JSON list of C-alpha atoms in Angstrom, two decimals:
[
{"chain": "A", "resi": 184, "resn": "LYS", "atom": "CA", "xyz": [-7.40, 3.19, -40.03]},
{"chain": "A", "resi": 185, "resn": "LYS", "atom": "CA", "xyz": [-4.83, 1.93, -37.75]},
{"chain": "A", "resi": 186, "resn": "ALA", "atom": "CA", "xyz": [-1.24, 3.40, -38.23]},
{"chain": "A", "resi": 187, "resn": "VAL", "atom": "CA", "xyz": [1.86, 3.55, -36.24]},
{"chain": "A", "resi": 188, "resn": "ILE", "atom": "CA", "xyz": [5.03, 5.75, -35.65]},
{"chain": "A", "resi": 189, "resn": "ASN", "atom": "CA", "xyz": [7.65, 4.76, -33.85]},
{"chain": "A", "resi": 190, "resn": "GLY", "atom": "CA", "xyz": [10.10, 8.18, -33.92]},
{"chain": "A", "resi": 191, "resn": "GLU", "atom": "CA", "xyz": [12.50, 5.37, -32.42]},
{"chain": "A", "resi": 192, "resn": "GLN", "atom": "CA", "xyz": [13.43, 4.64, -35.95]},
{"chain": "A", "resi": 193, "resn": "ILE", "atom": "CA", "xyz": [12.48, 7.89, -37.77]},
{"chain": "A", "resi": 194, "resn": "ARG", "atom": "CA", "xyz": [16.23, 8.68, -38.35]},
{"chain": "A", "resi": 195, "resn": "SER", "atom": "CA", "xyz": [15.71, 11.13, -40.99]},
{"chain": "A", "resi": 196, "resn": "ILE", "atom": "CA", "xyz": [12.45, 13.62, -42.24]},
{"chain": "A", "resi": 197, "resn": "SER", "atom": "CA", "xyz": [12.89, 10.40, -45.36]},
{"chain": "A", "resi": 198, "resn": "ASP", "atom": "CA", "xyz": [12.29, 7.79, -42.74]},
{"chain": "A", "resi": 199, "resn": "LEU", "atom": "CA", "xyz": [9.15, 9.44, -42.02]},
{"chain": "A", "resi": 200, "resn": "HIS", "atom": "CA", "xyz": [7.72, 9.38, -45.37]},
{"chain": "A", "resi": 201, "resn": "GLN", "atom": "CA", "xyz": [8.33, 6.46, -46.26]},
{"chain": "A", "resi": 202, "resn": "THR", "atom": "CA", "xyz": [7.04, 4.87, -42.94]},
{"chain": "A", "resi": 203, "resn": "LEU", "atom": "CA", "xyz": [3.69, 7.09, -43.77]},
{"chain": "A", "resi": 204, "resn": "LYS", "atom": "CA", "xyz": [3.36, 5.81, -47.03]},
{"chain": "A", "resi": 205, "resn": "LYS", "atom": "CA", "xyz": [3.35, 1.93, -45.96]},
{"chain": "A", "resi": 206, "resn": "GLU", "atom": "CA", "xyz": [1.39, 2.88, -42.53]},
{"chain": "A", "resi": 207, "resn": "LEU", "atom": "CA", "xyz": [-1.30, 5.03, -44.82]},
{"chain": "A", "resi": 208, "resn": "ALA", "atom": "CA", "xyz": [-0.92, 2.75, -47.81]},
{"chain": "A", "resi": 209, "resn": "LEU", "atom": "CA", "xyz": [-0.64, 6.36, -49.72]},
{"chain": "A", "resi": 210, "resn": "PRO", "atom": "CA", "xyz": [-0.56, 5.74, -53.52]},
{"chain": "A", "resi": 211, "resn": "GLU", "atom": "CA", "xyz": [2.80, 4.38, -55.12]},
{"chain": "A", "resi": 212, "resn": "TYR", "atom": "CA", "xyz": [4.04, 7.51, -56.61]},
{"chain": "A", "resi": 213, "resn": "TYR", "atom": "CA", "xyz": [3.97, 9.29, -53.24]},
{"chain": "A", "resi": 214, "resn": "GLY", "atom": "CA", "xyz": [6.36, 12.35, -53.42]},
{"chain": "A", "resi": 215, "resn": "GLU", "atom": "CA", "xyz": [6.97, 12.35, -49.79]},
{"chain": "A", "resi": 216, "resn": "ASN", "atom": "CA", "xyz": [5.90, 16.23, -49.39]},
{"chain": "A", "resi": 217, "resn": "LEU", "atom": "CA", "xyz": [4.35, 17.65, -47.10]},
{"chain": "A", "resi": 218, "resn": "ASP", "atom": "CA", "xyz": [2.21, 18.99, -50.32]},
{"chain": "A", "resi": 219, "resn": "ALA", "atom": "CA", "xyz": [1.66, 15.48, -51.14]},
{"chain": "A", "resi": 220, "resn": "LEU", "atom": "CA", "xyz": [1.01, 14.49, -47.68]},
{"chain": "A", "resi": 221, "resn": "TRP", "atom": "CA", "xyz": [-2.29, 17.02, -47.51]},
{"chain": "A", "resi": 222, "resn": "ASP", "atom": "CA", "xyz": [-3.54, 16.02, -51.08]},
{"chain": "A", "resi": 223, "resn": "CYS", "atom": "CA", "xyz": [-3.09, 11.78, -49.86]},
{"chain": "A", "resi": 224, "resn": "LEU", "atom": "CA", "xyz": [-5.13, 13.29, -46.82]},
{"chain": "A", "resi": 225, "resn": "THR", "atom": "CA", "xyz": [-7.61, 15.22, -48.47]},
{"chain": "A", "resi": 226, "resn": "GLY", "atom": "CA", "xyz": [-8.79, 12.54, -50.73]},
{"chain": "A", "resi": 227, "resn": "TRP", "atom": "CA", "xyz": [-6.81, 8.93, -50.89]},
{"chain": "A", "resi": 228, "resn": "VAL", "atom": "CA", "xyz": [-6.69, 8.14, -47.04]},
{"chain": "A", "resi": 229, "resn": "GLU", "atom": "CA", "xyz": [-9.75, 6.16, -45.83]},
{"chain": "A", "resi": 230, "resn": "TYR", "atom": "CA", "xyz": [-11.29, 7.74, -42.69]},
{"chain": "A", "resi": 231, "resn": "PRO", "atom": "CA", "xyz": [-11.88, 7.17, -39.40]},
{"chain": "A", "resi": 232, "resn": "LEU", "atom": "CA", "xyz": [-8.11, 6.89, -39.00]},
{"chain": "A", "resi": 233, "resn": "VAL", "atom": "CA", "xyz": [-6.47, 6.32, -35.73]},
{"chain": "A", "resi": 234, "resn": "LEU", "atom": "CA", "xyz": [-2.54, 7.58, -35.76]},
{"chain": "A", "resi": 235, "resn": "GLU", "atom": "CA", "xyz": [-0.43, 6.80, -32.59]},
{"chain": "A", "resi": 236, "resn": "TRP", "atom": "CA", "xyz": [3.19, 8.46, -32.83]},
{"chain": "A", "resi": 237, "resn": "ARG", "atom": "CA", "xyz": [5.25, 6.53, -29.91]},
{"chain": "A", "resi": 238, "resn": "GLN", "atom": "CA", "xyz": [7.77, 8.56, -29.02]},
{"chain": "A", "resi": 239, "resn": "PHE", "atom": "CA", "xyz": [7.40, 11.73, -30.35]},
{"chain": "A", "resi": 240, "resn": "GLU", "atom": "CA", "xyz": [10.44, 13.34, -29.21]},
{"chain": "A", "resi": 241, "resn": "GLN", "atom": "CA", "xyz": [13.18, 11.27, -30.81]},
{"chain": "A", "resi": 242, "resn": "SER", "atom": "CA", "xyz": [11.40, 11.99, -34.39]},
{"chain": "A", "resi": 243, "resn": "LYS", "atom": "CA", "xyz": [11.60, 15.54, -33.48]},
{"chain": "A", "resi": 244, "resn": "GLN", "atom": "CA", "xyz": [14.85, 15.88, -32.57]},
{"chain": "A", "resi": 245, "resn": "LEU", "atom": "CA", "xyz": [16.67, 13.79, -35.32]},
{"chain": "A", "resi": 246, "resn": "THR", "atom": "CA", "xyz": [14.61, 15.43, -37.97]},
{"chain": "A", "resi": 247, "resn": "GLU", "atom": "CA", "xyz": [15.76, 19.12, -37.77]},
{"chain": "A", "resi": 248, "resn": "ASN", "atom": "CA", "xyz": [12.17, 19.62, -35.74]},
{"chain": "A", "resi": 249, "resn": "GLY", "atom": "CA", "xyz": [10.73, 18.44, -39.77]},
{"chain": "A", "resi": 250, "resn": "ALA", "atom": "CA", "xyz": [8.20, 16.05, -37.56]},
{"chain": "A", "resi": 251, "resn": "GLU", "atom": "CA", "xyz": [5.64, 19.17, -36.69]},
{"chain": "A", "resi": 252, "resn": "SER", "atom": "CA", "xyz": [4.93, 20.18, -39.81]},
{"chain": "A", "resi": 253, "resn": "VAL", "atom": "CA", "xyz": [4.03, 16.77, -40.60]},
{"chain": "A", "resi": 254, "resn": "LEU", "atom": "CA", "xyz": [2.05, 16.69, -37.77]},
{"chain": "A", "resi": 255, "resn": "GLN", "atom": "CA", "xyz": [0.81, 20.03, -38.62]},
{"chain": "A", "resi": 256, "resn": "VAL", "atom": "CA", "xyz": [-0.73, 18.55, -41.80]},
{"chain": "A", "resi": 257, "resn": "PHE", "atom": "CA", "xyz": [-2.26, 16.06, -39.97]},
{"chain": "A", "resi": 258, "resn": "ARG", "atom": "CA", "xyz": [-3.78, 18.49, -37.22]},
{"chain": "A", "resi": 259, "resn": "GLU", "atom": "CA", "xyz": [-5.18, 20.43, -40.20]},
{"chain": "A", "resi": 260, "resn": "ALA", "atom": "CA", "xyz": [-6.93, 17.96, -42.06]},
{"chain": "A", "resi": 261, "resn": "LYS", "atom": "CA", "xyz": [-8.54, 16.88, -38.93]},
{"chain": "A", "resi": 262, "resn": "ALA", "atom": "CA", "xyz": [-9.35, 20.87, -38.88]},
{"chain": "A", "resi": 263, "resn": "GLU", "atom": "CA", "xyz": [-11.18, 21.32, -42.01]},
{"chain": "A", "resi": 264, "resn": "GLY", "atom": "CA", "xyz": [-13.14, 18.54, -41.05]},
{"chain": "A", "resi": 265, "resn": "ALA", "atom": "CA", "xyz": [-11.33, 14.94, -41.53]},
{"chain": "A", "resi": 266, "resn": "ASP", "atom": "CA", "xyz": [-12.14, 11.92, -39.17]},
{"chain": "A", "resi": 267, "resn": "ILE", "atom": "CA", "xyz": [-8.83, 12.02, -37.53]},
{"chain": "A", "resi": 268, "resn": "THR", "atom": "CA", "xyz": [-7.82, 10.99, -34.19]},
{"chain": "A", "resi": 269, "resn": "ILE", "atom": "CA", "xyz": [-4.04, 11.83, -32.79]},
{"chain": "A", "resi": 270, "resn": "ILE", "atom": "CA", "xyz": [-2.59, 9.53, -29.78]},
{"chain": "A", "resi": 271, "resn": "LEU", "atom": "CA", "xyz": [1.25, 11.53, -28.71]},
{"chain": "A", "resi": 272, "resn": "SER", "atom": "CA", "xyz": [2.58, 8.75, -26.65]},
{"chain": "B", "resi": 1367, "resn": "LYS", "atom": "CA", "xyz": [-4.67, 9.93, -14.62]},
{"chain": "B", "resi": 1368, "resn": "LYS", "atom": "CA", "xyz": [-7.67, 10.56, -17.23]},
{"chain": "B", "resi": 1369, "resn": "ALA", "atom": "CA", "xyz": [-8.48, 13.77, -18.20]},
{"chain": "B", "resi": 1370, "resn": "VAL", "atom": "CA", "xyz": [-10.96, 14.87, -20.98]},
{"chain": "B", "resi": 1371, "resn": "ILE", "atom": "CA", "xyz": [-11.83, 18.47, -22.16]},
{"chain": "B", "resi": 1372, "resn": "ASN", "atom": "CA", "xyz": [-14.56, 18.87, -24.85]},
{"chain": "B", "resi": 1373, "resn": "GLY", "atom": "CA", "xyz": [-13.61, 21.90, -26.62]},
{"chain": "B", "resi": 1374, "resn": "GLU", "atom": "CA", "xyz": [-17.79, 22.06, -27.24]},
{"chain": "B", "resi": 1375, "resn": "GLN", "atom": "CA", "xyz": [-18.01, 24.15, -24.06]},
{"chain": "B", "resi": 1376, "resn": "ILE", "atom": "CA", "xyz": [-14.74, 26.16, -23.50]},
{"chain": "B", "resi": 1377, "resn": "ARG", "atom": "CA", "xyz": [-16.16, 28.42, -25.04]},
{"chain": "B", "resi": 1378, "resn": "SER", "atom": "CA", "xyz": [-14.02, 30.77, -22.96]},
{"chain": "B", "resi": 1379, "resn": "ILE", "atom": "CA", "xyz": [-10.11, 30.84, -22.17]},
{"chain": "B", "resi": 1380, "resn": "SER", "atom": "CA", "xyz": [-11.61, 30.96, -18.77]},
{"chain": "B", "resi": 1381, "resn": "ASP", "atom": "CA", "xyz": [-14.08, 27.91, -18.95]},
{"chain": "B", "resi": 1382, "resn": "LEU", "atom": "CA", "xyz": [-10.47, 26.27, -20.06]},
{"chain": "B", "resi": 1383, "resn": "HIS", "atom": "CA", "xyz": [-9.02, 26.61, -16.88]},
{"chain": "B", "resi": 1384, "resn": "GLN", "atom": "CA", "xyz": [-11.61, 26.08, -14.96]},
{"chain": "B", "resi": 1385, "resn": "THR", "atom": "CA", "xyz": [-11.97, 22.52, -16.45]},
{"chain": "B", "resi": 1386, "resn": "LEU", "atom": "CA", "xyz": [-8.23, 21.98, -16.04]},
{"chain": "B", "resi": 1387, "resn": "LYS", "atom": "CA", "xyz": [-8.76, 23.09, -12.38]},
{"chain": "B", "resi": 1388, "resn": "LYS", "atom": "CA", "xyz": [-11.65, 20.50, -12.17]},
{"chain": "B", "resi": 1389, "resn": "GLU", "atom": "CA", "xyz": [-10.15, 17.28, -14.43]},
{"chain": "B", "resi": 1390, "resn": "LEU", "atom": "CA", "xyz": [-6.65, 17.14, -13.37]},
{"chain": "B", "resi": 1391, "resn": "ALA", "atom": "CA", "xyz": [-7.80, 18.49, -9.53]},
{"chain": "B", "resi": 1392, "resn": "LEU", "atom": "CA", "xyz": [-5.06, 20.90, -9.15]},
{"chain": "B", "resi": 1393, "resn": "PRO", "atom": "CA", "xyz": [-4.74, 23.05, -6.03]},
{"chain": "B", "resi": 1394, "resn": "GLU", "atom": "CA", "xyz": [-7.68, 25.07, -4.59]},
{"chain": "B", "resi": 1395, "resn": "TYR", "atom": "CA", "xyz": [-5.53, 28.25, -5.64]},
{"chain": "B", "resi": 1396, "resn": "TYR", "atom": "CA", "xyz": [-4.54, 27.61, -8.84]},
{"chain": "B", "resi": 1397, "resn": "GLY", "atom": "CA", "xyz": [-4.35, 31.05, -10.93]},
{"chain": "B", "resi": 1398, "resn": "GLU", "atom": "CA", "xyz": [-5.35, 30.08, -14.03]},
{"chain": "B", "resi": 1399, "resn": "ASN", "atom": "CA", "xyz": [-2.58, 31.25, -15.54]},
{"chain": "B", "resi": 1400, "resn": "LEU", "atom": "CA", "xyz": [0.19, 29.45, -17.87]},
{"chain": "B", "resi": 1401, "resn": "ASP", "atom": "CA", "xyz": [2.42, 29.94, -15.25]},
{"chain": "B", "resi": 1402, "resn": "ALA", "atom": "CA", "xyz": [0.41, 28.12, -12.46]},
{"chain": "B", "resi": 1403, "resn": "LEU", "atom": "CA", "xyz": [-0.31, 24.88, -15.36]},
{"chain": "B", "resi": 1404, "resn": "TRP", "atom": "CA", "xyz": [3.30, 25.07, -15.57]},
{"chain": "B", "resi": 1405, "resn": "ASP", "atom": "CA", "xyz": [4.15, 24.76, -12.02]},
{"chain": "B", "resi": 1406, "resn": "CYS", "atom": "CA", "xyz": [0.96, 22.47, -10.69]},
{"chain": "B", "resi": 1407, "resn": "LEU", "atom": "CA", "xyz": [1.98, 19.94, -14.02]},
{"chain": "B", "resi": 1408, "resn": "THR", "atom": "CA", "xyz": [5.58, 19.88, -12.48]},
{"chain": "B", "resi": 1409, "resn": "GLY", "atom": "CA", "xyz": [4.61, 19.12, -8.72]},
{"chain": "B", "resi": 1410, "resn": "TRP", "atom": "CA", "xyz": [0.96, 18.42, -8.32]},
{"chain": "B", "resi": 1411, "resn": "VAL", "atom": "CA", "xyz": [-0.36, 16.63, -10.65]},
{"chain": "B", "resi": 1412, "resn": "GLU", "atom": "CA", "xyz": [0.27, 12.81, -10.30]},
{"chain": "B", "resi": 1413, "resn": "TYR", "atom": "CA", "xyz": [1.22, 11.02, -13.25]},
{"chain": "B", "resi": 1414, "resn": "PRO", "atom": "CA", "xyz": [0.70, 8.84, -15.55]},
{"chain": "B", "resi": 1415, "resn": "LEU", "atom": "CA", "xyz": [-1.62, 11.01, -17.59]},
{"chain": "B", "resi": 1416, "resn": "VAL", "atom": "CA", "xyz": [-3.73, 10.74, -20.38]},
{"chain": "B", "resi": 1417, "resn": "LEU", "atom": "CA", "xyz": [-5.25, 13.77, -21.63]},
{"chain": "B", "resi": 1418, "resn": "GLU", "atom": "CA", "xyz": [-8.07, 13.83, -24.19]},
{"chain": "B", "resi": 1419, "resn": "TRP", "atom": "CA", "xyz": [-8.94, 17.03, -26.13]},
{"chain": "B", "resi": 1420, "resn": "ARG", "atom": "CA", "xyz": [-12.12, 16.28, -27.93]},
{"chain": "B", "resi": 1421, "resn": "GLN", "atom": "CA", "xyz": [-12.88, 18.49, -30.41]},
{"chain": "B", "resi": 1422, "resn": "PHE", "atom": "CA", "xyz": [-9.57, 20.88, -30.20]},
{"chain": "B", "resi": 1423, "resn": "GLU", "atom": "CA", "xyz": [-10.69, 22.86, -33.22]},
{"chain": "B", "resi": 1424, "resn": "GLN", "atom": "CA", "xyz": [-13.65, 24.94, -31.65]},
{"chain": "B", "resi": 1425, "resn": "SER", "atom": "CA", "xyz": [-11.46, 24.75, -27.85]},
{"chain": "B", "resi": 1426, "resn": "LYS", "atom": "CA", "xyz": [-8.61, 26.51, -30.05]},
{"chain": "B", "resi": 1427, "resn": "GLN", "atom": "CA", "xyz": [-10.78, 29.17, -32.63]},
{"chain": "B", "resi": 1428, "resn": "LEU", "atom": "CA", "xyz": [-13.44, 30.17, -29.75]},
{"chain": "B", "resi": 1429, "resn": "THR", "atom": "CA", "xyz": [-10.64, 31.46, -27.51]},
{"chain": "B", "resi": 1430, "resn": "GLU", "atom": "CA", "xyz": [-8.69, 33.68, -29.58]},
{"chain": "B", "resi": 1431, "resn": "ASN", "atom": "CA", "xyz": [-6.09, 30.62, -30.39]},
{"chain": "B", "resi": 1432, "resn": "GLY", "atom": "CA", "xyz": [-5.04, 30.52, -26.60]},
{"chain": "B", "resi": 1433, "resn": "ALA", "atom": "CA", "xyz": [-5.95, 27.19, -26.27]},
{"chain": "B", "resi": 1434, "resn": "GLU", "atom": "CA", "xyz": [-2.36, 26.21, -28.43]},
{"chain": "B", "resi": 1435, "resn": "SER", "atom": "CA", "xyz": [-0.21, 27.45, -25.70]},
{"chain": "B", "resi": 1436, "resn": "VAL", "atom": "CA", "xyz": [-2.13, 25.60, -22.88]},
{"chain": "B", "resi": 1437, "resn": "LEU", "atom": "CA", "xyz": [-1.37, 22.38, -24.81]},
{"chain": "B", "resi": 1438, "resn": "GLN", "atom": "CA", "xyz": [2.09, 23.51, -25.41]},
{"chain": "B", "resi": 1439, "resn": "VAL", "atom": "CA", "xyz": [2.48, 23.45, -22.15]},
{"chain": "B", "resi": 1440, "resn": "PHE", "atom": "CA", "xyz": [1.44, 19.83, -21.91]},
{"chain": "B", "resi": 1441, "resn": "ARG", "atom": "CA", "xyz": [3.65, 19.48, -25.02]},
{"chain": "B", "resi": 1442, "resn": "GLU", "atom": "CA", "xyz": [6.65, 20.47, -22.43]},
{"chain": "B", "resi": 1443, "resn": "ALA", "atom": "CA", "xyz": [5.99, 18.90, -19.38]},
{"chain": "B", "resi": 1444, "resn": "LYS", "atom": "CA", "xyz": [6.08, 15.60, -21.43]},
{"chain": "B", "resi": 1445, "resn": "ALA", "atom": "CA", "xyz": [9.17, 17.73, -23.29]},
{"chain": "B", "resi": 1446, "resn": "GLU", "atom": "CA", "xyz": [10.98, 17.72, -19.82]},
{"chain": "B", "resi": 1447, "resn": "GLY", "atom": "CA", "xyz": [9.60, 14.16, -18.58]},
{"chain": "B", "resi": 1448, "resn": "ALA", "atom": "CA", "xyz": [6.63, 14.10, -17.38]},
{"chain": "B", "resi": 1449, "resn": "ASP", "atom": "CA", "xyz": [4.81, 10.77, -18.51]},
{"chain": "B", "resi": 1450, "resn": "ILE", "atom": "CA", "xyz": [1.69, 12.33, -19.88]},
{"chain": "B", "resi": 1451, "resn": "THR", "atom": "CA", "xyz": [-0.15, 10.89, -23.02]},
{"chain": "B", "resi": 1452, "resn": "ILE", "atom": "CA", "xyz": [-2.39, 13.86, -25.17]},
{"chain": "B", "resi": 1453, "resn": "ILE", "atom": "CA", "xyz": [-5.00, 12.26, -27.50]},
{"chain": "B", "resi": 1454, "resn": "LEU", "atom": "CA", "xyz": [-6.08, 14.75, -29.85]},
{"chain": "B", "resi": 1455, "resn": "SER", "atom": "CA", "xyz": [-9.60, 13.78, -30.93]}
]
């Protein structure tokens, strides 16, 4: 239901997926890829879901800007329909 | 401090600026343009500011996708430094 990401520790784009896997309790085989996140967003994850991304800045820069694609996947699920709330603190 | 935009009514990109003007209590001469928003974000508006954008979907589509540039201005102010919180509900 509630997920929390602190760009403080996401030193890498793999850090990002390792965190989402636990936070969103994705499946054990989570392939750590936008494709696997989408599918997970479209079938495994249980909504409502409110995601708080603390300090999106760091997590953005310390990842070659690879955090913005992940966020867009979330922003896309919401679009298609998923009940997601995203707090960019 | 707290601003609320409901893409439910932002039928146009001018609706967007008419709303920001009131919600953020921008100046009477607010020119309704990204340039005037930026400046307003960089001197007039008082922080902390928590901006809630309900149903960003509609407000995105029913505006030729012109809502994304506005949001990026806010995402930029935050970047440069502004104390802004963005809830995309």
